[PDB]
Amino acid sequence: MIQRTPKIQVYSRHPAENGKSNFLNCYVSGFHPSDIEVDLLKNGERIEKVEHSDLSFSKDWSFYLLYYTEFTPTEKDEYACRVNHVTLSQPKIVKWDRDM
Template sequence: MKMKELLLFLSCVLCVSADVLHEDIAIVGCSDSDGEEMYGLDGEELAYADFNKQEEIYPQPPFIDPITYPGGYEQAVADQQVCRENLKNFGKGMKDYPPEHDAPSAVMIYTRDEVEFGENNTLICHVTGFYPAPVNVSWTKNGQKVTGSSINVPYPNKDGTFTQISRLQFTPQLGDIYSCAVQHLALTQPLTKIYDVEASGQSDPGVGPAAFCGVGLTVGLLGVAAGTFFLIKGNECS
């Protein structure tokens, strides 16, 4: 091995850094009328305290080994008492500072599964980039309010804002139009996103895979070209 190649190899080894394999998070929050305690792993909720049902909720998919926190709800209740005492003390010291309000930076509506008319599906309203939490999400079908939706507890983003996801079970039918409206302290009027079942059903299902294959082929050809270039340059330098 030539000296310059050895130095290049050693330089690359010295530049390697260890990446974080997993990130977990625990959140305790409270207000005068509400509270939150949540545990997460790698951007997903593992458990949260439901103070209305008075139990710990584990919103984990059925295909993973369940992770539980024995005594988690009792701990959450105790943490809320400490949080409210701290809230009183901080409120006195911070009363002259105006609260920060960041409106949602993005609201998206989409389906969980590929649309098939007459088949049960889930509409998802994804709201992110807001502060403080939470947001309120309401749904309509053909202009009429619908109930039965669910929403997760606020999940923190790395920039200090929050994300929440609301879900609505529905059966796609031609002509139906759904909407999700997002309300937040920083908004003067709700942010509304529309989902048109007919427009979604008429989209060409082959466009997505074809575009993906086209991009993959282009990236592959660029990789071959780059490899050939460096091989030729390496032979010239030998």
């Protein structure tokens, strides 16, 4: 009745240019079981129009999901991805380094 903790990457679809429409992604992978919570945060606040891919899995049976939302990066704004899962003692926050 296995458990695997998710691996989290937060990043942009295209390289960030301030004032230009883009897409922010939190990709979570290698996790089990499939119940997982993923929010994208703009300055500590949950972004509301966040979509995600349909649940799928890798050859080792571990799940992956991509959450994404179209945004407009600015020099001021801070973005992050918060992920909760049974393998996590508390919600994990991973900040968007326009690099990572």
